[PDB]
Structures are given as C-alpha cells and as structure tokens.
Amino acid sequence: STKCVTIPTEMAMCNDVGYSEMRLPNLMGHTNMAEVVPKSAEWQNLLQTGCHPYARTFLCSLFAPVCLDTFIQPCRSMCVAVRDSCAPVLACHGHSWPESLDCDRFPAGEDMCLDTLLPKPSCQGCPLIEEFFSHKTVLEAFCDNNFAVKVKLAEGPVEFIKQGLLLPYDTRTMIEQWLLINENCAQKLIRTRPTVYVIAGDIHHGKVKVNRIFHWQKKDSQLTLATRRWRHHKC
Structure with a gap:
C-alpha cells in the first residue's frame, strides 16, 4: 500500500520546498514518518554547508517524493553532481556518501528523471x-x-x-x-x-x-x- 501524507514541519529537510505532501514508502524505502523524519535529520548539518545548490532538491526527491504511484527518480547526473560537491564535506565530518545513494542506482540520461535544464x-x-x-x-x-x-x-x-x-x-x-x-x-x-x-x-x-x-x-x-x-x- 502507498499513501500520500503531509510533510510535517518537524521534517526540516523538506518542510519549505514548495509542495506540502509526500509519498510513502519513499524512494529510500522508509515506510512511515517515524522513520522518515530522523533519517532525514541526519542530513541537516550537511544541507547547511551550502555544498551544492541542488542538494536539498536531490534529497527531498528521495525522502519526500511527490504523490504519484510512479517513482520519479533523480537522474544519475544529478546524483553525481551533488555527490562530487558534498561527499568532500561529509568526509570532513568523518562521514561518507552512503551506499544507499551510490549514483549507479539512478538512471542514466534525462528521460523520466529529475535533472537540471557562492564561493x-x-x-x-x-x-x-x-x-x-x-x-x-x-x-x-x-x-x-x-x-x-x-x-x-x-x-x-x-x-x-x-x-x-x-x-x-x-x-x-x-x-x-x-x-x-x-x-x-x-x-x-x-x-x-x-x-x-x-x-x-x-x-x-x-x-x-x-x-x-x-x-x-x-x-x-x-x-x-x-x-x-x-x-x-x-x-
């Protein structure tokens, strides 16, 4: 079963990104909001570093996907661009880019996926x-x-x-x-x-x-x- 649920304000990752409702399960395989919110909170420090302008867009498309039964995945090239700018920051915190986000899991090309058209x-x-x-x-x-x-x-x-x-x-x-x-x-x-x-x-x-x-x-x-x-x- 898949359901459409409101993004709670306690989800800081995605509480101010333009849409207000999300699909469960999400693209991370989380099945309920008690799982979604603390897992998403692990990224809060990273997102404040400004390491990539699309970091929050990329993560919200996985953590708080729109309410279709079809999953619209980020394109591989978006994963690669965010990983290459933000994995150095994770490493500076003693963390690594998670294997759950290795960019080979996302489709190559630009069909049916999310892509992109200060110092x-x-x-x-x-x-x-x-x-x-x-x-x-x-x-x-x-x-x-x-x-x-x-x-x-x-x-x-x-x-x-x-x-x-x-x-x-x-x-x-x-x-x-x-x-x-x-x-x-x-x-x-x-x-x-x-x-x-x-x-x-x-x-x-x-x-x-x-x-x-x-x-x-x-x-x-x-x-x-x-x-x-x-x-x-x-x-």
Missing part, C-alpha cells in the same frame, strides 16, 4: 591560531590574501579589513559555512568564552581558503596597530 569553503587543514605576532606580519598577511575580516565567535557581525568584492551578508554566510564544514577547526576556535579573531583568506576560483587566523586578545596592541595602518599601508 565554496573546502575541507582544509586548520590554520594556526596565531597569538604572538607583530603588526608587520599581520600587514603582510593583509597584502597577500584577498580578504580579511574581524569576526567574533561564540558568530556576531563582521567588520571588513580588506573587503574586495565581498558583500557583508555573503561573507557572514561563507564564514559560518567554513566553520560548519571544518568542524575540527571550529572546535579549537570557539573555545568558549566568546573570542575575537582576524581571519585572512583567499577566494580563488571559486573556492574560499582561510590562510591566516589571528587571535584578538583583550589587551591587544598588534592587531589594533595593523588595522589602523592598513588603510595607508603600501604592499
């Missing part, structure tokens, strides 16, 4: 949290990297030192995505109490890479001096 943080080594630095070294970091920001983590409102093309909202989100991906690094940084850092990095093509992190301590002089002189500094 991304990557999993990287943790930057040293620098503490005994001179303002000269900070300024050289500002010259080299194409952005630098002052942020407070606990992650409050961000002050640009070297802004470039960056928009404030986008930069905030890029930082939070970097912290969510790089869980091991976040844990060293967000050692409560709330802490202030200067973060210098590079938005290459088209990835974000954090290269330098400077701890802004209570009675700092060197980051103060560096941020004051940056405006008039010559590289």
Whole structure:
C-alpha cells in the first residue's frame, strides 16, 4: 500500500520546498514518518554547508517524493553532481556518501528523471591560531590574501579589513559555512568564552581558503596597530 501524507514541519529537510505532501514508502524505502523524519535529520548539518545548490532538491526527491504511484527518480547526473560537491564535506565530518545513494542506482540520461535544464569553503587543514605576532606580519598577511575580516565567535557581525568584492551578508554566510564544514577547526576556535579573531583568506576560483587566523586578545596592541595602518599601508 502507498499513501500520500503531509510533510510535517518537524521534517526540516523538506518542510519549505514548495509542495506540502509526500509519498510513502519513499524512494529510500522508509515506510512511515517515524522513520522518515530522523533519517532525514541526519542530513541537516550537511544541507547547511551550502555544498551544492541542488542538494536539498536531490534529497527531498528521495525522502519526500511527490504523490504519484510512479517513482520519479533523480537522474544519475544529478546524483553525481551533488555527490562530487558534498561527499568532500561529509568526509570532513568523518562521514561518507552512503551506499544507499551510490549514483549507479539512478538512471542514466534525462528521460523520466529529475535533472537540471557562492564561493565554496573546502575541507582544509586548520590554520594556526596565531597569538604572538607583530603588526608587520599581520600587514603582510593583509597584502597577500584577498580578504580579511574581524569576526567574533561564540558568530556576531563582521567588520571588513580588506573587503574586495565581498558583500557583508555573503561573507557572514561563507564564514559560518567554513566553520560548519571544518568542524575540527571550529572546535579549537570557539573555545568558549566568546573570542575575537582576524581571519585572512583567499577566494580563488571559486573556492574560499582561510590562510591566516589571528587571535584578538583583550589587551591587544598588534592587531589594533595593523588595522589602523592598513588603510595607508603600501604592499
């Protein structure tokens, strides 16, 4: 038996994707909502990393499929595109792309399947949290990297030192995505109490890479001096 049931608000994967009802069993083989919801919740961290714009579409088509008796599967090429961008993020959390989503289970081509007609943080080594630095070294970091920001983590409102093309909202989100991906690094940084850092990095093509992190301590002089002189500094 197959039934059409409303997507409950507690299913964060799919509670705001445009349609409101789903098929049981779903394409994952879950038979009831007590199974669907916690299994879907395993993906909540991943979906917040922004690793692929179609990640949520892809997963909802499997977890909350539309109410036909025919299964409309994602096309293999959609699985491959989402896997290739998001499996590196899973690996950064100690997880792997599940065998239940190996892309060979989905049809090749584009008939009867779901297909497609900003800079991304990557999993990287943790930057040293620098503490005994001179303002000269900070300024050289500002010259080299194409952005630098002052942020407070606990992650409050961000002050640009070297802004470039960056928009404030986008930069905030890029930082939070970097912290969510790089869980091991976040844990060293967000050692409560709330802490202030200067973060210098590079938005290459088209990835974000954090290269330098400077701890802004209570009675700092060197980051103060560096941020004051940056405006008039010559590289």
